[PDB]
RNA sequence: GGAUAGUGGCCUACCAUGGUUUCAACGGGUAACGGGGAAUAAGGGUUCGAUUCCGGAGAGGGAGCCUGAGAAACGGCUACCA
RNA sequence: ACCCACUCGGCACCUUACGAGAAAUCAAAGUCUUUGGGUUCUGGGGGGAGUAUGGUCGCAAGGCUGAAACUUAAAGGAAUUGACGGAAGGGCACCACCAGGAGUGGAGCCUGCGGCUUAAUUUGACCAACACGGGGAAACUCACCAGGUCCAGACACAAUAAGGAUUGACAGAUUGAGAGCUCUUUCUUGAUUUUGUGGGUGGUGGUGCAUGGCCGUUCUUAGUUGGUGGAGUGAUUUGUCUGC
RNA sequence: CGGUUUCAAGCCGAUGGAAGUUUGAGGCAAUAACAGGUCUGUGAUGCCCUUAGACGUUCUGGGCCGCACGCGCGCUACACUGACGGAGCCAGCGAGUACAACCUUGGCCGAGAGGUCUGGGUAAUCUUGUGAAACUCCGUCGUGCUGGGGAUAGAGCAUUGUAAUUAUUGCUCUUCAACGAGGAAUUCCUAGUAAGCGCAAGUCAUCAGCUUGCGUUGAUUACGUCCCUGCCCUUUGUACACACC
RNA sequence: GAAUCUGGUCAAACUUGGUCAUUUAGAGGAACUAAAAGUCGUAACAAGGUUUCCGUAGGUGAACCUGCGGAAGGAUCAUUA
RNA sequence: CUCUAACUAUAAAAAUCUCUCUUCUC
RNA sequence: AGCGCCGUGGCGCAGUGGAAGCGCGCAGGGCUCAUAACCCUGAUGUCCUCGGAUCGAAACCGAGCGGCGCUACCA
């Protein structure tokens, strides 16, 4: 039959688009159906965020974050568990998961 | 010993020996394969190979150590009459039937049957999968 | 099945067939 | 012009370059004689029509024929092929 | 450049069914049996096969075109609830592991199986068979066997027959036998029987793949449902469920 | 009662009490199924078969108990926490004779198993307080396939039983093998539990390593997780629906 | 006014070869059906244990894999976290 | 009828199967 | 006629100075409802015949046997 309406690609009236490569797999993916993500983090982990603080010069310190916009195919992606499968009731909802923390 | 064919019974041809087979585990090894090679002036590899091909099963090829196994229960018959089919499709030429041709690449890859008797160059059936075997080795240079 | 293969199989008979008669035309 | 009961490239002679076509020509096929009709049946329709009626066509295959108003006749002929 | 209000055109999107679909869904897949805006091209079961063949284009790889014989009753679409999934998630089990404990498999013996053997090693079980059928049986029990008995063959009909339907038996042989089973010989007994048939009991005889009944397991887990009532034409589903 | 919970279901710790894991264990225990087993339990039976030299029944005897082998329940040992001579002396389940031979006490002979005379008991009386083992103490053995181990091979003595050979069972002596903790793998298990140890009862004329219960000595290591093997629920894809065999 | 016979004339027909249609054997060559207890592996249906499938090209006992481009018929309709 | 923030990381091998398919009525 | 090689448990190689070696064989067991894969455990032997060396020689050497690769038909 019909997966989803968008075929899960949303291009829907584009023709082509230039492909992209997944960060796991690396296999050659459009660029719409290539599930990726924003890994923003701080530069260090949260665990010794105390220590390196007063371990440095320069008190009163900003603490840089390093980013990454991560392109991950579907396999890599549903393998580990950064996506979870769904019920087609419950696929359609695009809204992001609601803020994962607050 | 054969007279190097099997639907021909001269008293003077040249001649080959027959292949035989022991059990391994199972796997059955050919003991007379270098010997026939050397009287068909063809390269063990293909004989092993092409039984093979009209067989269709896993086999292990080894020639610098005398280990030639070919999987599967097949009693001598069987494998006298593929290897007979390598003869008549590989080693005996057109007109003669000369039961010594070597296996020759001209300058196209023309795989070809060629003779010392008639010594012609037979067109040689490269609509076979051995054809596509003995041109990935070279004969007596890539072995 | 992989219709792929069965193509490409019938392609392949093909050329052969065409090159039986090359040689022997 | 000839020839024909009489038109007409019917045939000839001199010329002229034309005629037909995707609106299906020409070629091929037709276990097709065409029709009146038959079967079938809401209506639209599908198939069959060698065969009682109509026409047309044949007398083994082609040709040629006198006679006769009317014949290219065949229970009339001239010839070849079978 | 922004916000408001309206609109034109474009990709789309959300709800809905008002329709329509084989449904999955679709704002067109609608305005389609209440059958008819105009429109070019396609397909008539699956294979055989995009195959053969003849063209055609091509340097070639190859494209456009394009069968039939034959062969089969299904192939197939959506959709259902199950099963499955080295698929995901939520909880479980000491018939799973973990921590360890204790062992089994090593030794001998006992018992139970299989296979070999013998007449037979009677047979049924192959997680849920195997110290099980109380299967720890010297007879039996017994279902195995070499043998020996006996009828515990009703009832009915026919059948004989009281000058005998018939049974029983000391002794010898014969049989282990102290069995009158069999004989040799005689005596006993009397109408219950004896011999045929119709019909009949017994059968650890066969068939659990004909069955009950019984218990085993599936399965000690948490699972199972119907009456309205709703959601689908239906097969069904919801009630049985988001969480804790 | 104190924590912990949208403050709800409840969960955790502590106090108190015998009992604070559904207090402990059990037994009853759903729908639907299986081609599971059993006609060898029946006087439950269909159907088929045999029914008189019988597959019925009975009598004897042989057989169910044999062995080039393998696997699967168990028992005793592989020794020093031991074994052995003696002493010390704690239990609970049970059971037990009628139209007949059970429970055995006590006293007598035997070294023993046994045998005799009596005695109570149809059962809280009698066996009984089953004086059970394991266990403890005191001696001996001294790390040696040795007093561990005792299979097995000889001879005899007893008892039950119509009948013990193919050793029934018990006892006496001699023989004393293999056994040095056991490959791959696998089973069981969380508290009076595991383990050892015995007792009883079913089977029983007579025989247990069997089993059902009972009690004795009495635990290391958790108080968890889905890694293996499964299970339950939900989602999901299936070309599976004889269901991953 | 017959025979014979000049011409042409319609022209059947015969030979000769070309050329075609249809049957037609045919050394040998290459396939497909049905037969489902042949053999080798297990390609596919689940993430089929390397996602499938398609076009293309090479190779590969066989399945098929491979490189490049695609599509969801996928296992993602989903990051203004 | 007034809120816009945090975050991690496995992929070892598993190949296969010839069974019977059975019936619903007041 | 002489020199270089060898002497298996069923087969291919090896260490030959502590005395039967592995793979592959095979009998059996383990795993799986089942088969294989795998896991493991076991059985065959006179490193050729006889001596020297050595605590001990299949083994270092030798006084030869059987078989091989060259010289090459060597009056
Ligand atoms: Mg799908
Ligand atoms: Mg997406
Ligand atoms: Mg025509
Ligand atoms: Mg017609
Ligand atoms: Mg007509
Ligand atoms: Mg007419
Ligand atoms: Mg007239
Ligand atoms: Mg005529
Ligand atoms: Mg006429
Ligand atoms: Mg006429
Ligand atoms: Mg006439
Ligand atoms: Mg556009
Ligand atoms: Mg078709
Ligand atoms: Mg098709
Ligand atoms: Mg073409
Ligand atoms: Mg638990
Ligand atoms: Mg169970
Ligand atoms: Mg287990
Ligand atoms: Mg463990
Ligand atoms: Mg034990
Ligand atoms: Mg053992
Ligand atoms: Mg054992
Ligand atoms: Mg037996
Ligand atoms: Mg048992
Ligand atoms: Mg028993
Ligand atoms: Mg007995
Ligand atoms: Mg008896
Ligand atoms: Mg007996
Ligand atoms: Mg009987
Ligand atoms: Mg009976
Ligand atoms: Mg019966
Ligand atoms: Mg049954
Ligand atoms: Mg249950
Ligand atoms: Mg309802
Ligand atoms: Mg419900
Ligand atoms: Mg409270
Ligand atoms: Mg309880
Ligand atoms: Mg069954
Ligand atoms: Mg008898
Ligand atoms: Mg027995
Ligand atoms: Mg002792
Ligand atoms: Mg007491
Ligand atoms: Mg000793
Ligand atoms: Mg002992
Ligand atoms: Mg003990
Ligand atoms: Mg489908
Ligand atoms: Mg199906
Ligand atoms: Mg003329
Ligand atoms: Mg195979
Ligand atoms: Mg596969
Ligand atoms: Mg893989
Ligand atoms: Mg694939
Ligand atoms: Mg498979
Ligand atoms: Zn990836
Ligand atoms: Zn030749």
Same mark, same amino acid.
């Given at each position: 039959?019909?997966? @989803?309406?968008?075929?899960? #690609?949303?291009?829907?009236?584009?023709?082509?688009?230039?492909?992209?490569?997944?960060?796991?797999?690396?296999?050659?993916?459009? *660029?719409?159906?290539?599930?990726?993500?924003?890994?923003? &983090?701080?530069?260090?982990?949260?665990?010794?965020?105390?220590?390196?603080? +007063?371990?440095?010069? !320069?008190?009163?310190?900003?603490?840089? *974050?390093?980013?990454? =916009?991560?392109?991950?195919?579907?396999?890599?992606?549903?393998?580990? @568990?950064?996506?979870?499968?769904?019920?087609?009731?419950?696929?359609?909802?695009?809204?992001?998961?609601?803020?994962?923390?607050? | 010993?054969?007279?190097?064919?099997?639907?021909?019974?001269?008293? !003077?041809?040249?001649?080959?020996? $027959?292949?035989?087979?022991?059990? +391994?585990?199972?796997?059955?090894?050919?003991?007379?394969?270098?010997?026939?090679?050397?009287?068909?002036? &063809? $390269?063990? $590899?293909?004989?092993?190979?092409?039984?093979?091909?009209?067989?269709?099963?896993?086999?292990?090829?080894?020639?610098?150590?005398?280990? !030639?196994?070919?999987?599967?229960?097949?009693?001598?018959?069987?494998?006298?009459?593929?290897?007979?089919?390598?003869?008549?499709?590989?080693?005996?030429?057109?007109?003669?039937?000369?039961?010594?041709? +070597?296996?020759?690449?001209?300058?196209?890859?023309?795989?070809?049957?060629?003779?010392?008797?008639?010594? =012609?160059?037979?067109?040689?059936?490269? &609509?076979? =999968?051995?054809?596509?075997?003995?041109?990935?080795?070279?004969?007596?240079?890539?072995? | 099945?992989?219709?792929?293969?069965?193509?490409?199989?019938? #392609?392949?008979? *093909? &050329?052969? #067939?065409?090159?039986? #008669?090359?040689?022997?035309?």
């Amino acid at each position: 039959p019909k997966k @989803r309406a968008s075929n899960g #690609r949303n291009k829907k009236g584009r023709g082509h688009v230039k492909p992209v490569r997944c960060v796991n797999c690396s296999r050659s993916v459009p *660029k719409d159906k290539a599930i990726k993500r924003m890994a923003i &983090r701080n530069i260090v982990e949260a665990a010794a965020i105390r220590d390196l603080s +007063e371990a440095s010069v !320069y008190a009163e310190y900003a603490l840089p *974050k390093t980013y990454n =916009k991560l392109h991950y195919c579907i396999s890599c992606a549903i393998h580990a @568990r950064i996506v979870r499968v769904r019920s087609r009731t419950d696929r359609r909802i695009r809204a992001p998961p609601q803020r994962p923390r607050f | 010993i054969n007279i190097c064919r099997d639907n021909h019974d001269p008293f !003077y041809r040249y001649k080959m020996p $027959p292949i035989q087979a022991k059990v +391994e585990g199972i796997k059955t090894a050919v003991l007379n394969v270098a010997d026939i090679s050397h009287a068909l002036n &063809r $390269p063990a $590899p293909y004989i092993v190979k092409y039984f093979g091909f009209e067989l269709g099963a896993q086999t292990s090829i080894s020639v610098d150590k005398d280990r !030639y196994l070919v999987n599967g229960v097949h009693e001598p018959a069987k494998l006298q009459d593929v290897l007979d089919g390598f003869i008549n499709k590989f080693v005996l030429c057109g007109s003669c039937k000369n039961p010594e041709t +070597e296996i020759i690449i001209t300058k196209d890859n023309d795989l070809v049957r060629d003779c010392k008797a008639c010594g =012609k160059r037979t067109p040689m059936d490269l &609509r076979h =999968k051995l054809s596509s075997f003995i041109l990935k080795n070279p004969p007596d240079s890539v072995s | 099945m992989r219709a792929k293969w069965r193509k490409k199989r019938t #392609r392949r008979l *093909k &050329r052969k #067939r065409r090159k039986v #008669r090359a040689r022997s035309k």
